């Protein structure tokens, strides 16, 4: 009756230690809680203490491989929470160990990116040790759980094995990211920390379109525009407020890029009167590195937008079945395991997946829009300069 | 613009009416969103008109400069001031482009914010609708109408 | 604050006064009537598909 | 823009600063110099998190030893009378705060239990020590974060004893006076030297025209900081024509000193612009000699009234004596 | 050889000093100034040693009373529920840390236990007092943050207001202000007296050529500190030949002043050797006006621009005027 | 072992001063009791800090 | 508080046992000698000399 971590099966006899403590499925689950609880307690006072700006804008190495890893790691953790709630539907016992370990892992992951972001702005890499002593701490225990699921021959049929096997790789991937930061900056137990300075474009106080120089999530969310929009509501926009554009988008820099493309396009092709074909090749070579990025985001955005209609089909199909009988149909080691063929059949799970897919789809579509616009606006600047 | 505004606003209110009818709980959930949405709408409008007006102003000199450079090309080159005029263009082109770039950023900020708000509505409408149909036996077609 | 005024009453009155009495109310009722049918056809579809 | 604000909050953009490394001591210092409500939240979170973290591992040890398993009298648990995580939370609270009820207590032959008890006590002692140190230094230093020194919004240039004098009024809003008050006045100007030197914010120190030529000032009733503009004084060429707002002629008055109660040296800088300087005006007398004591009408503290005075230039004033 | 290092380490050698006191009270100061990892190690060791030492003596007392011998007897033990040294260690932990579980409790059996309980509590109370005392002293050291002032790597001799003057640059990297700042300039030379005296390291005060004729300055932006080389200075006999590395000359600049936030005095000594004195150079202007706030370019803090200056002697230069 | 306000007065004396005799102790299955124990412990510690700070 | 006074307990500024009077740069000069034992500097040191006599 009381909320029990392992459960109340057979007079709470799931807490036995005999035949090895590591062989107990509850304990390996409990060991997973610990690294998350460690990081929450360790870094919570640290984020509460810290609570021009150019000097605090340097980006750590792997600034993109961390955010995309966190988001996919957040996604699999949402799936783990959803799967665990499916697993305890059969038994009357709460079985809190199915989702609470995973649930607060997602909470701890959010704090890790918040804590890392604070270190990214405030250039204090020496604090980027808690995450290191956490990531391996979050990896070691997870590997134990994975091996134990392999020890009981769970197999890929069970959804938990697939998520755990995927989630350990995600923890492994970003563990490499953390030590990569150590290798470049060389601040821990090293002799000469390599000097990294913020980009010279933002050093001047005359840059206010800080789109290149911002975290990846705010790159896809345009969070930096909130300050400008709020400022707009009081002080009318003048050219003083919109300080000049960064060096990556300046008309002169664009013309240099356009000019260098023409030299490449006219050197090898001697019979190039700089006609339509030569100009088109010049435009493609100069701005292809961004047009493809816009297309990649746009193609991914189109594919994700289709998951919404599929999600509706799954939701309404499950709802039309008046039986409304749900069960995982198996209990591998005293804990019921749900399969993938039924995980994507649940209405609530499908609705959550639809919400997550919608978030991703809209971000990618809007990200593709801006990339195309920036390339289009940049080409206009370069084309006008060449015509003049 | 008048026709598009009327259709767009009528489609919007039609959608909220259906979702509230499909799930009355959404009415409660409409109170927060319709609050924050106004803020997003109000701030964007003030940030748009200014930006739009600024964009139009910044187009006037650039194009005019082009006309001068062809009506007075001989004098321009005779004075040996081509380098200064090239720099004048680059400043003009940068001013116009950043005016346009910020307008697009303002457009995208509104679009993403409204997209998230609409995505939250989908979750709220879905959650309430499945709960109604599993327990209170809501019509399956009504669930489909709410989600669509 | 003065610049950020939409001037809705002035502009709406100009269009309303120029349009008159008949062609203004007709557009409002016609546009509303068209959209209430669109809600109805989806709603009727739900009942029929049910 | 001005390099010193009226409220004494100087603001100069220290752009392009070499990246001095950051240390954990800065974070520790930030904890010490935090506000009062924030300190309570930090320490309450620190105490609660410490108990919770150790309660979690106490639960692990009991679970790994079979203590959390159903009843069995043969085995002796690493911690007696530990059943659920609620008991584990209570046991950690008792150990760290040293309440020690004794219903749940440590037992022998469980070396991990002894080790964590040592670790928890050592951690608890260091956490408590930090809290006492933070609280102890908070009462000492945070009391000296109040600036009760008021200058005049607008200064004057008047005619006292025949010689022109630049005057401003400063008063004390705290009953305890500032001990050993030193006043420093500096004219800030982009004075390009005739030899060719150019400096953007050259500071020229200005004398005080005190009774001894020093910089000591007694602060009981507000007084006028009057400096006689002479040939030595750079204000020898001051004119109302160069008194407009867009003129590079700014005065900085700094009254350093130590408050008797605490002993911490205090500084309160103020900046006066040419537009903020009112030529040919006189400060209103303040101290009225009542029957028993002296009355100070602080309402008319920084109010300046006109007076018929010469309006020529102090450099041109030398001709009148000649 | 140098009088004071460029950073301010002041590399000087002391020798032939009489027997220092080396009392007991100084060793505590050594404990006060320990590093954070070392202080933690010292205190963890002290607490653990105290717990263990008393744990041994409680075990010995239980052994002496014949209480840990197996077999229940009517003789009440000195301390109850003690059956091993591990139990004895736990009881010592409970008494000293004042947890006091109560599973193992003192009894009125033997007065030796009562006397030794007093000793453990007093030692535990005094150890906490020492630990808390050291924490207070060490916490101030964290708030200290002393060395954060910057000086140019090389000083100049330039022409300000027409007159030659020695000049250096001072900068405050700290955001916080330094109240009651003071500049002290000194010439460290080997000068001989007309009576035969040969002072090894003579230090001559050098005026700062301030407006008020004082040593007070005000550092909010990097400033030029210059002394006008005139007839009242030991540099009046300078020459371009006095630029070799092994030339007998040295300039010391001292920036005293109490930090506003900390409220304690800090010192920043720097030295300029003859090879670090650059004739015919000027300091580039640094502060650039901006719409938002005045901007300071700290990259060019030490950068200089060459300017033709009289390559003569000040005695001949001033007289020729 | 709570039987009157006198016993309750003694329990608060034991916890705030951190004596903890153990005759009256906090049990489980009463989360409200646990929450106030945390609140009373925090309040007692902050009062001691004020007293120690004021003494300094 | 005793910990605070532990650092300030001892002072180690050394003065010469006896003084001298010998001309320096032609001018007659009284002279004493001063020194510091501890490595730590004494900041803002100030020397005040006084002639005490019955007049
Ligand atoms: N009676 C007073 N009590 C406290 N501060 C005062 C008083 N009178 C003046 N001051 C301070 O002196 C400065 C200006 O002095 P002055 O007497 O000219 O005031 P003011 O013209 O009313 O200024 P403000 O516009 O800042 O209110 C301000 O910093 C103001 O806060
Ligand atoms: N090396 C040193 N270490 C410590 N104190 C010293 C040292 N040299 C001098 N002093 C201090 O300066 C005083 C004068 O030193 P001096 O060279 O005259 O020694 P002294 O004649 O042997 O001294 P005394 O007989 O007073 O001890 C000494 O009395 C002592 O207090
Ligand atoms: N931008 C700066 N920010 C901080 N300190 C600086 C800066 N520039 C110089 N310094 C300091 O001034 C001294 C050297 O000044 P200088 O301008 O010659 O720099 P440098 O040639 O880059 O020196 P170094 O190689 O010693 O770092 C050093 O003490 C250095 O710390």
Angle between helices D85-96 and D36-64 (to 10 degrees): 120
Is residue G49 packed enough to be buried (19+ CB in 10 Å), middle (13-18) or exposed (0-12)?
Answer: exposed
Is residue D265 packed enough to be buried (19+ CB in 10 Å), middle (13-18) or exposed (0-12)?
Answer: buried
Count, in order, helices (H) and strands (E) of chain F.
Answer: 2, 0
- Is F11 annotated as ligand-binding? no
Phi/psi for D110 (5° steps) reads: -110, 85
Q: Do B127 and A384 touch (CB under 8 A)?
A: no
Q: How far apart are CA E246 and CA B74, in angstroms?
A: 66
Residue for token digits 């990200």? A367
Q: Which helix (H) or strand (E) holds C34?
A: helix C22-49
Cα E12 to ligand 2 centre (Å): 20
Residue of D116, D207, D303, D128 lying closest to E93 (CA atoms): D116
Q: How far apart are CA E219 and CA E181, in angstroms?
A: 8
The string over B97-127, giving b where at least 16 C-beta atoms fall within 10 Å of a residue's C-beta and e elsewhere, is: bbbbbbbbbbbbbbbbbebbeebbbbbbbbb
Classified as helix, coil or strand, E136 is: helix
D100: left (phi over 0), alpha (psi -120 to 50) or beta: left
Residue of A138, A147, A127 lying closest to A173 (CA atoms): A138
C-beta separation of A3 from A94 below 8 A: yes
Ligand 1: which atom is nearest the Cα of residue D153? 14
- Alpha helices (H) in chain D, listed in sequence order: 24-32, 36-64, 85-96, 111-141, 314-321
- Cβ neighbours of residue G28 under 8 Å, at least 6 residues apart? G21
Q: How far apart are CA D162 and CA E93, in angstroms?
A: 83
Cα D151 to ligand 1 centre (Å): 7
Angle at F32 between CA F28 and CA F35, to 5 degrees: 90
Residue of A248, A236, A240, A237 lying closest to A211 (CA atoms): A248
Radius of gyration of chain D (CA): 33
Q: How far apart are CA D66 and CA D75, in angstroms?
A: 9
Q: Which two tokens stand for residue D257?
A: 């000193």
Looking at residue C22, what DSSP letter applies?
H
Q: Do B126 and A351 touch (CB under 8 A)?
A: yes
Looking at residue G27, what DSSP letter applies?
B
Q: How far apart are CA D15 and CA E296, in angstroms?
A: 6
**Largest Cα–Cα distance of chain D, in whole Å?**
115
Strand E265-266, strand D304-306: pairing? unpaired
CA-to-CA dists, residue B102 to A143, A377, C24, D192, D232, angstroms = 48, 11, 38, 42, 55
Q: How far apart are CA E228 and CA E248, in angstroms?
A: 21
- Is E298 annotated as ligand-binding? yes
Whether E17 lines ligand 2, by a CB cut-off of 6 Å, is: yes
Q: Strand (E) positions, G1-55?
A: 13-15, 20-21, 30-31, 34-36
Residue for token digits 């006590």? D121
C-beta separation of D296 from D289 below 8 A: no
Phi/psi for A298 (5° steps) reads: -65, -40
CA-to-CA dists, residue E37 to A126, E43, E241, angstroms = 15, 10, 52
Mark which residues 43-62 of D lie under 8 Å from F by CB: 43-44, 47-48
Q: How far apart are CA F39 and CA G20, in angstroms?
A: 73
Phi/psi for E4 (5° steps) reads: -140, 140
Q: How far apart are CA E271 and CA E251, in angstroms?
A: 6
Residues F4, F7, F9, F11: is their CA dihedral positive or negative? Answer: negative
Residue D183: count of CB within 10 angstroms of its CB:
20
C-beta separation of D120 from D54 below 8 A: yes
Is residue B18 packed enough to be buried (19+ CB in 10 Å), middle (13-18) or exposed (0-12)?
Answer: buried
Residue A60: count of CB within 10 angstroms of its CB:
19
Q: How far apart are CA E251 and CA E274, in angstroms?
A: 9
Residues pairing with E167 in the sheet: E156, E226
Q: How far apart are CA B8 and CA B122, in angstroms?
A: 19
Strand D227-228, strand D149-150: pairing? unpaired
Q: How far apart are CA D240 and CA D247, in angstroms?
A: 11
Choice from D175, D302, D304, D305 to test ligand 1 binding pocket (greatest atom count within 8 A of CB): D302
Residue for token digits 């345009």? A222
Q: Which two tokens stand for residue E114?
A: 């009562």
Q: Which helix (H) or strand (E) holds E126?
A: helix E111-144
Q: Which helix (H) or strand (E) holds E52?
A: helix E36-64
The string over B131-145, giving b where at least 16 C-beta atoms fall within 10 Å of a residue's C-beta and e elsewhere, is: ebbeeeebbbbbbbb
Q: Do E137 and G3 touch (CB under 8 A)?
A: yes
C-beta separation of E131 from D129 below 8 A: yes
Q: How far apart are CA F20 and CA A278, in angstroms?
A: 89
Residue of B102, B109, C1, B53 lying closest to A235 (CA atoms): C1
Residues D46, D48, D52, D55: is their CA dihedral positive or negative? Answer: positive
Q: How far apart are CA A156 and CA A146, in angstroms?
A: 12
CA E179 to chain centroid: 19
Q: Do E29 and G6 touch (CB under 8 A)?
A: yes
Cα D220 to ligand 1 centre (Å): 17
Count, in order, helices (H) and strands (E) of chain E.
Answer: 5, 14
C-beta separation of D295 from D287 below 8 A: yes
Phi/psi for B39 (5° steps) reads: -55, -50
Phi/psi for F18 (5° steps) reads: 60, 60
Q: Which two tokens stand for residue A340?
A: 């993938």
C-beta separation of E90 from D95 below 8 A: no
First CA to last CA distance, chain B: 26
Compute the residue count for chain B: 148
- Give the one of C4, C38, C46 whose C-beta lies nearest to B142's C-beta: C46
Resolution in angstrom units: 7.4
Q: What is the DSSP string of E89-122?
A: HHHHHHHHTT---SSS-B-SS-HHHHHHHHHHHH
- Residues in contact with ligand 3 (CB, 6 Å cut-off): D 17-18; E 150, 152-153, 173, 298-299, 301-302
Q: Which two tokens stand for residue G37?
A: 């034992």
Q: How far apart are CA E177 and CA E159, in angstroms?
A: 30
Residue D191: count of CB within 10 angstroms of its CB:
17
Nearest ligand, CA E284: 3
Classified as helix, coil or strand, D258 is: strand
Residue of G48, G52, G50 lying closest to G34 (CA atoms): G48
Residue for token digits 């006064």? C17
Residue C20: count of CB within 10 angstroms of its CB:
10
Q: Which two tokens stand for residue E164?
A: 């030659």
Cα G50 to ligand 2 centre (Å): 22
Q: Which two tokens stand for residue A78?
A: 């949402």
Q: How far apart are CA D272 and CA D189, in angstroms?
A: 12
| Three-state secondary structure readout of D191-238 | CCCCCCCCCCCEEEEECCCCCCCCCEECCCCCEECCEECCCCCHHHHC
- Residues in contact with ligand 1 (CB, 6 Å cut-off): D 150-153, 173, 298, 301-302
Q: How far apart are CA E74 and CA A157, in angstroms?
A: 67
Residue for token digits 């009722």? C29
Classified as helix, coil or strand, D271 is: strand
Report which protein residue has its CA nearest ligand 3's atom 17: E302
Q: Which two tokens stand for residue E95?
A: 């008494």
CA atoms within 13 A on the CB side of A69: 21
- Cβ neighbours of residue A242 under 8 Å, at least 6 residues apart? A208, A209, B54, B98, B99, B102
| Three-state secondary structure readout of chain B | CHHHHHHHHHHHHHHHHHHHHHCCHHHHHHHHHHHHHHHHHHHHHHHHHHHHHHHHHHHHHHHHHHHHHHHCHHHHHHCCCHHHHHHHHHHHHHHHHHHHHHHHHHHHHHHHHHHHHHHHHHHHHHHHHHHHHHHHCCCHHHHHHHHC
Q: How far apart are CA D95 and CA D113, in angstroms?
A: 12
Ligand 3: which atom is nearest the Cα of residue E303? 17
Helix, strand, coil: what percent of chain D each, to 5? 30, 25, 45
CA dihedral A214, A220, A225, A226 (to 10 degrees): -110
Choice from G12, G13, G14, G32 to test ligand 2 binding pocket (greatest atom count within 8 A of CB): G14
Q: How far apart are CA A13 and CA D167, in angstroms?
A: 88
Angle between helices B82-131 and A225-232 (to 10 degrees): 100
C-beta separation of B79 from A375 below 8 A: no
| Three-state secondary structure readout of chain A | CCCCCCCCCCCCHHHCCCCCCCCCHHHHHHHHHHHHHHHHHHHHHHHHHHCCHHHHCCCCCCHHHHHHHHHHHHHHHHHHHHHHHHHCCCCCCCCHHHCHHHHHHHHHHHHHHHHHHHHHHCCCHHHCCHHHHHHHHHHHHHHHHHHHHHHCCCCCCEHHHHHHHHHHHHHHHHHHHHHHHHHHHCCCCCCCCCCCCCCHHHHCCCCCCCCCCCCHHHHHHCCCHHHHHHHHCCCCCCCCCCCCCCCCCCHHHHHHHHHHHHHHHHHCCCCCCCCHHHHHHHHHHHHHHHHHHHHHHHHHHHHHHHHHHHHHHHHHHHHHCCCCCCCCCCECCCCECCEHHHHCCCHHHHHHHHHHHHHHHHHHHHHHHHHHHHHHHHHHHHHHHHHC
Q: Experimental technique used?
A: cryo-EM
Compute the residue count for chain C: 50
Is residue E99 packed enough to be buried (19+ CB in 10 Å), middle (13-18) or exposed (0-12)?
Answer: buried
CA D139 to chain centroid: 14
Q: How far apart are CA D220 and CA E78, in angstroms?
A: 70
Give partners of B (≥3 CB pairs < 8 A): A, C
Whether G12 lines ligand 2, by a CB cut-off of 6 Å, is: no
């Amino acid at each position: 009756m009381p909320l029990a971590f392992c459960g109340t099966e057979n007079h709470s006899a799931a807490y036995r230690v005999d035949q090895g403590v590591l062989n107990n499925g509850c304990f390996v689950d409990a060991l997973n809680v610990v690294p998350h609880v460690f990081l929450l307690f360790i870094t919570f006072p640290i984020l509460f203490i810290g609570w021009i700006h150019h000097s605090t804008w340097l980006h750590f190495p792997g600034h993109n491989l961390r955010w995309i890893l966190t988001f996919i790691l957040l996604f699999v953790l949402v799936c783990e929470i959803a799967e665990g709630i499916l697993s305890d539907g059969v038994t009357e016992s709460r079985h809190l160990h199915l989702y609470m370990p995973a649930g607060m892992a997602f909470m701890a992951a959010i704090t890790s990116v918040v804590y890392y972001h604070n270190i990214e702005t405030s250039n204090f890499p020496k604090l980027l040790i808690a995450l290191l002593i956490y990531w391996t701490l979050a990896f070691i225990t997870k590997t134990i759980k994975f091996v134990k699921f392999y020890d009981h021959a769970i197999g890929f049929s069970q959804l938990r094995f697939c998520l755990t096997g995927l989630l350990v790789i995600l923890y492994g991937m970003l563990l490499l990211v953390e030590v990569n930061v150590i290798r470049v900056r060389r601040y821990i137990f090293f002799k000469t920390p390599r000097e990294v300075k913020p980009p010279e474009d933002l050093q001047d106080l005359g840059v206010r379109f800080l789109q290149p120089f911002v975290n990846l999530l705010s790159k896809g969310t345009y969070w930096w525009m909130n300050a400008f929009i709020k400022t707009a509501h009081k002080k009318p926009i003048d050219l003083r407020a919109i300080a000049k554009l960064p060096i990556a988008m300046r008309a002169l820099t664009n013309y240099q890029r356009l000019c260098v493309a023409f030299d490449a396009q006219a050197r090898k092709d001697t019979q190039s009167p700089q006609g339509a074909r030569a100009i088109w090749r010049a435009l493609c070579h100069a701005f292809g590195r961004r047009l493809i990025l816009s297309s990649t985001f746009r193609i991914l955005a189109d594919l994700l937008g289709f998951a919404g209609p599929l999600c509706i089909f799954g939701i309404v199909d499950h709802l039309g079945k008046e039986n409304h009988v749900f069960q995982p149909k198996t209990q591998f080691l005293g804990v019921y395991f749900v399969s993938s063929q039924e995980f994507l059949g649940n209405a609530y799970v499908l609705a959550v997946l639809l919400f997550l897919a919608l978030l991703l789809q809209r971000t990618f579509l809007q990200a593709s829009y801006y990339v195309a616009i920036e390339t289009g606006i940049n080409l206009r600047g370069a084309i006008q300069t060449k015509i003049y | 613009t008048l026709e598009c505004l009327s259709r767009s606003t009528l489609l919007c209110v039609s959608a909220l009416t259906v979702i509230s009818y499909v799930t009355p709980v959404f009415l409660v959930a409409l109170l927060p969103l319709a609050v924050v949405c106004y803020f997003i709408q109000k701030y964007f409008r003030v940030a748009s008109r200014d930006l739009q007006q600024l964009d139009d102003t910044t187009q006037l000199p650039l194009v005019s400069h082009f006309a001068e450079t062809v009506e007075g090309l001989t004098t321009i080159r005779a004075f040996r001031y081509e380098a200064r005029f090239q720099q004048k263009l680059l400043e003009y082109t940068d001013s116009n482009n950043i005016a346009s770039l910020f307008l697009t950023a303002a457009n995208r900020w509104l679009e993403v914010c409204m997209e998230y708000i609409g995505a939250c509505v989908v979750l709220i409408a879905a959650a309430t609708s499945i709960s109604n149909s599993l327990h209170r036996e809501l019509s399956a077609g009504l669930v489909g109408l709410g989600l669509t | 604050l003065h610049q950020r005024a939409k001037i809705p009453w002035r502009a709406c009155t100009k269009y309303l006064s120029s349009a008159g009495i008949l062609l203004l109310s007709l557009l409002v009722f016609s546009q509303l009537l068209k959209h209430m049918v669109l809600v109805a056809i989806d709603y009727w579809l739900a009942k029929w598909t049910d | 823009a001005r390099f010193v604000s009226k409220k004494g909050n100087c603001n100069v953009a220290h752009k392009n600063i070499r990246e001095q490394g950051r240390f954990l001591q800065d974070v520790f210092t930030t904890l010490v110099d935090l506000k009062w409500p924030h300190t309570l939240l930090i320490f309450t979170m620190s105490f609660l998190c410490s108990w919770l973290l150790f309660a979690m591992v106490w639960w692990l040890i009991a679970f790994a030893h079979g203590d959390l398993a159903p009843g069995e009298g043969t085995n002796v648990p690493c911690v007696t009378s530990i059943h659920s995580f609620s008991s584990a939370f209570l046991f950690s609270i008792e150990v760290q705060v040293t309440i020690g009820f004794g219903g749940r207590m440590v037992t022998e032959e469980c070396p991990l239990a002894i080790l964590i008890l040592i670790v928890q006590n050592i951690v608890g002692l260091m956490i408590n020590a930090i809290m006492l140190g933070c609280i102890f230094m908070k009462t000492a230093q945070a009391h000296r974060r109040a600036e009760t020194l008021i200058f005049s919004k607008h200064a004057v240039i008047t005619l006292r004893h025949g010689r022109l004098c630049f005057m401003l009024r400063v008063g004390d809003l705290r009953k305890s006076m500032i001990i050993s008050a030193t006043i420093h006045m500096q004219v800030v100007r982009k004075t390009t030297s005739p030899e060719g030197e150019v400096v953007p914010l050259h500071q020229v120190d200005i004398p005080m025209e005190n009774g001894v030529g020093g910089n000591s000032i007694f602060l009981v009733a507000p007084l006028i900081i009057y400096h006689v503009i002479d040939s030595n004084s750079p204000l020898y060429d001051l004119a109302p024509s160069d008194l407009h707002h867009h003129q590079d002629l700014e005065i900085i008055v700094i009254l350093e000193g130590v408050v008797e109660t605490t002993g911490i040296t205090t500084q309160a800088r103020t900046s006066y612009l040419a537009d903020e300087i009112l030529w040919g005006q006189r400060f209103v007398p303040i101290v009225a000699e009542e029957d028993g004591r002296y009355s100070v009408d602080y309402s008319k503290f920084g109010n300046t009234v006109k007076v018929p005075t010469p309006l020529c230039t102090a450099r041109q004033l030398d001709e009148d004596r000649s």
